[PDB]
């Protein structure tokens, strides 16, 4: 009813500005032949709204996946992308969005001894896009569980605050593993959204309308 007031130059505004402009730079618009003026401006606008909103979708997926990844590094929290259904559902959703965008361009019709091997190599990226995120979010957490189980044998067996180099050399290793999991948590959201731009912008191609009649010279 009454919207909130926003300070200009806020840090989340500048961050989301940079993030949206980064994901919008991935699939840039195509330069026409005729220079853009009032003649070509409806062709530019109508080229602009036949292209998919891969900027908005890619920063949607970047924000939800980096938030769900960085949840796993807060205390008392799991990463939601560590679930199989969550992460692989995001992967199947990006593959299905690319497929629906590529099917609606032609006729909603689905496309000899080789092209089934291209179809199986295209249908697999549905599995790969989500399973890469899920297995990355599961593997570092599982390894962290196992190794802080192994670090927990030493102060249990030896004394508390005793034999400190043996537990120090594993607590330093565990700290470097949580740092690597921070780096993987940022990079897997980056890789998911880069691949969303690639897989969806493979089908982000239409005909430029252009001028069909011209008063030359």
């Amino acid at each position: 009813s009454s919207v909130r007031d926003v300070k200009t130059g806020s840090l989340p505004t500048n961050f989301l500005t940079g993030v949206y402009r980064f994901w919008r730079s991935q699939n840039p618009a195509e330069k026409p032949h005729d220079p853009v003026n009032d003649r070509l401006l409806p062709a530019v606008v109508d080229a602009s709204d036949k292209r998919a909103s891969i900027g908005t979708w890619a920063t949607t997926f970047f924000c939800t996946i980096i938030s769900c990844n960085l949840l796993g590094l807060m205390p008392f929290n799991e990463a939601p992308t560590s679930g199989l259904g969550f992460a692989t559902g995001l992967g199947v959703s990006v593959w299905a969005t690319a497929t629906i965008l590529g099917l609606s361009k032609t006729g909603f019709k689905f496309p000899f001894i080789f092209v089934p091997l291209e179809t199986i190599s295209y249908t697999f990226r549905a599995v790969s896009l989500g399973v890469r995120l899920w297995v990355n979010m599961l593997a570092g957490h599982t390894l962290l569980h196992i190794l802080t189980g192994m670090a927990l044998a030493l102060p249990f067996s030896l004394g508390f605050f005793s034999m400190v180099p043996a537990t120090f050399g594993v607590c330093c290793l565990l700290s470097a593993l949580v740092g690597l999991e921070y780096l993987v948590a940022v990079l897997q959201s980056g890789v998911f959204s880069i691949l969303s731009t690639v897989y969806v912008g493979e089908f982000n191609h239409d005909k430029f309308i252009g001028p069909a009649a011209k008063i030359v010279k």
Partner: protein
């Protein structure tokens, strides 16, 4: 229980295909460093090819892990 033993040791001999991926991605991510030290002025084109190459070579690693999961829990 010989089937539920052979599944575990078959997955253990199944996941060694993560070696060749983990070396090919090493030479690709080293070729990124080399080619970005040759001319750094295209180092968002070459990182954009490095991530396409990484993400298209690790589909092999996910094929390997799918065969792992399908001979463990299937």
């Amino acid at each position: 229980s010989v089937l539920a033993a052979s599944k575990m040791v078959g997955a253990g001999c199944a996941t060694i295909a993560l070696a060749g991926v983990g070396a090919g991605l090493g030479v690709m991510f080293g070729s990124l460093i080399n080619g970005a030290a040759r001319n750094p002025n295209i180092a968002k084109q070459l990182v954009g090819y490095a991530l396409l190459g990484f993400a298209l070579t690790e589909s092999i690693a996910l094929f390997s892990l799918l065969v792992v999961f399908l001979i463990l829990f299937a």
